Amino acid sequence: LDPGLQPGQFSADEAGAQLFAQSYQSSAEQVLFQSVAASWAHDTNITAENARRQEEAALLSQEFAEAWGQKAKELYEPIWQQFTDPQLRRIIGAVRTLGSANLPLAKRQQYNALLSQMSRIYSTAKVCLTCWSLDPDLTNILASSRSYAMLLFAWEGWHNAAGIPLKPLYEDFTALSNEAYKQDGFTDTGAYWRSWYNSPTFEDDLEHLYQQLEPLYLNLHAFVRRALHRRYGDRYINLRGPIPAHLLGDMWAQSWENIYDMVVPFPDKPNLDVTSTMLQQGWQATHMFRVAEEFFTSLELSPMPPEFWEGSMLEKPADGREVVCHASAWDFYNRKDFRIKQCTRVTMDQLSTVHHEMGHIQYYLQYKDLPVSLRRGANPGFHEAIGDVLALSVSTPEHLHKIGLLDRVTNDTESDINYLLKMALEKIAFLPFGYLVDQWRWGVFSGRTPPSRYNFDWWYLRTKYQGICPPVTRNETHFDAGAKFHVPNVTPYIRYFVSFVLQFQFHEALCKEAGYEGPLHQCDIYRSTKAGAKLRKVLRAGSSRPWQEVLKDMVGLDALDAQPLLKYFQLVTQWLQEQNQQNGEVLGWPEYQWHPPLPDNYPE
Ligand SMILES: *[C@@H]1O[C@H](CO[C@@H]2O[C@@H](C)[C@@H](O)[C@@H](O)[C@@H]2O)[C@@H](O[C@@H]2O[C@H](CO)[C@@H](O[C@@H]3O[C@H](CO)[C@@H](O)[C@H](O)[C@@H]3O)[C@H](O)[C@H]2NC(C)=O)[C@H](O)[C@H]1NC(C)=O
Ligand SMILES: O=C(O)[C@@H]1C[C@@H](C2CCCCC2)CN1C(=O)CP(=O)(O)CCCCc1ccccc1
Ligand SMILES: *[C@@H]1O[C@H](CO)[C@@H](O[C@@H]2O[C@H](CO)[C@@H](O)[C@H](O)[C@H]2NC(C)=O)[C@H](O)[C@H]1NC(C)=O
Ligand SMILES: *[C@@H]1O[C@H](CO[C@@H]2O[C@@H](C)[C@@H](O)[C@@H](O)[C@@H]2O)[C@@H](O)[C@H](O)[C@H]1NC(C)=O
Ligand SMILES: [Ca+2]
Ligand SMILES: [Cl-]
Ligand code: NA
Ligand SMILES: [Zn+2]
């Protein structure tokens, strides 16, 4: 570790810890910048040389974390929990968490190499017949093909190409990750991840939220399954079984918005899928980011700095570079450089993703003056919710009209049902998936799910919560969890379930603050500087304060709450229940063992 980056001696008291934290911040920014920059260079240009550079930067970060973490314990272990400065307690708490820096050198290198190789495999995997990438090629097939056999080829091809080679690496990663965090005092890595929510009843709290939400998902599921049965027929759709996992418009069946045309009940109302209008009008990726930015500035939040426009990767490169296309938002920890890396496609759902990413950036801009250790969301679910809250306002027909994407605005109950159904395909359908991904990983980290049951337990959970089934037989040579970005890229997922609940609590509070009085689903907080001020107070707080207190200041409650989401969707919840009763549906999938047959001439 460079001499200028090493911790000196400080007095073993709170005054000394303040100075220690200031000195840490100065050097941490340098070490994080080099690590984030090396990761950027690789993720926008996947090469062996750039991977090498990123692994060397990660090794330096581990040296830094070990030196400062050990110094924090040497000086403050018996006293930091009693410091009067609550933010300093949180800073010291973070610095003394070494994570992978607990590993000896050789295992650090193995750990860093595994992360690099799992990332490369996921983002360079192809499906060949001439080869298709996940983004845009297979994504577009899953979204717009209605050939059962073509969807199956893409779904099976992708899961095989990404998942199979990842399994041996993921086993090794898990063991090293657990070894690292056991030395920070956690039973396993999942316990460390769950500890971020600082709730002794986290898992019970989540389960009670899901019990309130599940009836909405069950009714959406049955209605969509019936719509698919009318198109694909009784051979490929079992009205009492799980839905084949490749038929819902998305590789992971996690968002069902692409099958809106098959379920829309009132099709002579305005067409809420504005993708075709975006294309007709000549929208490009940069337009989508400028439109998102101007929503933020309408709230008197910050515009994107020049460094963002000059440095970001907002489209897939056409120069032959391999890149990580999965959308992400980057803080370089120098208070200057902030970037999005997204292979943006011109579609309505990508407009939502753009807003999601710019919500991340906006958080970074607002808390950039805090100490580096507090530059994060009040909890990770907060960070995932910011952009989604704005996207809820952007998606309303009145707002789409204002930005020229919808010529006619109607305000009637049929239009309400269309709108809420489309939003439910996006928000309700996701809930079981957002919940189940980390249940899978928590079991892997705890040892409940050994490598010999990776796929067995994945599909147990996929069927249990989502009510889907694989369209071809799978076995433990397959590693289908690994075919989802966040698993090989070691990004926790429960934050997205928390986000999908939280964003409706935020929306309700900001709509009230904006003076809006009508139905929650027609609120648009555009140009509400009062709502902007309330959101800004959250963003500027970072992790300086307990999330429960930040939430209470914002929405009036110190806990996650499903009631705002339930209230948003109430009209379509009742409508779907009525439709399913009238149609004689079975809610759920009691024929849980059912899988569809293979097409006759497959893959031929
Ligand atoms: C879409 O339309 C709904 C319903 O509009 C109502 O019913 C129609 C058939 C017409 O008769 C309308 O004239 C009538 O308002 C709108 O929802 C309604 O919004 C108004 C405010 O714009 C709400 O009134 C307020 O209520 C609060 C608390 O009660 C008072 O403090 C205010 O002073 C004000 O009176 C009204 O409650 C609300 N109704 C429902 C059922 O939500 C909706 O705003 C509209 N959408 C858009 C985008 O304009
Ligand atoms: O794709 C998913 O599964 C989820 C749900 C989706 C969301 C889009 C808007 C509407 C609701 C669904 C967004 N997302 C993401 O992973 C996008 P991120 O930036 O969090 C992914 C961040 C990955 C970790 C990272 C962070 C910084 C730099 C490099 C890597
Ligand atoms: C992608 O990364 C590679 C390195 O992995 C870059 O190639 C280097 O480019 C510099 C300047 O052009 C040369 O001096 C080096 O000799 C190159 N190294 C190798 C290994 O080829 C490449 O420029 C990057 N591409 C983009 C578009 O940024
Ligand atoms: C695992 O699965 C591989 C792929 O074939 C699958 O299983 C066979 C039995 C058929 O049902 C086919 O439709 C499926 O896609 C096999 O190549 C492999 O042998 C299977 N077994 C193991 C241990 O890997
Ligand atoms: Ca779409
Ligand atoms: Cl999380
Ligand atoms: Na989608
Ligand atoms: Zn995100």
Numbering used by the authors: 1 to 129, 135 to 609
What do the authors say?
Human angiotensin I‐converting enzyme (ACE) has two isoforms, somatic ACE (sACE) and testis ACE (tACE). The functions of sACE are widespread, with its involvement in blood pressure regulation most extensively studied. sACE is composed of an N‐domain (nACE) and a C‐domain (cACE), both catalytically active but have significant structural differences, resulting in different substrate specificities. Even though ACE inhibitors are used clinically, they need much improvement because of serious side effects seen in patients (~ 25–30%) with long‐term treatment due to nonselective inhibition of nACE and cACE. Investigation into the distinguishing structural features of each domain is therefore of vital importance for the development of domain‐specific inhibitors with minimal side effects.
These structures allowed detailed analysis of the molecular features conferring domain selectivity by fosinoprilat. Particularly, altered hydrophobic interactions were observed to be a contributing factor. These experimental data contribute to improved understanding of the structural features that dictate ACE inhibitor domain selectivity, allowing further progress towards designing novel 2nd‐generation domain‐specific potent ACE inhibitors suitable for clinical administration, with a variety of potential future therapeutic benefits.
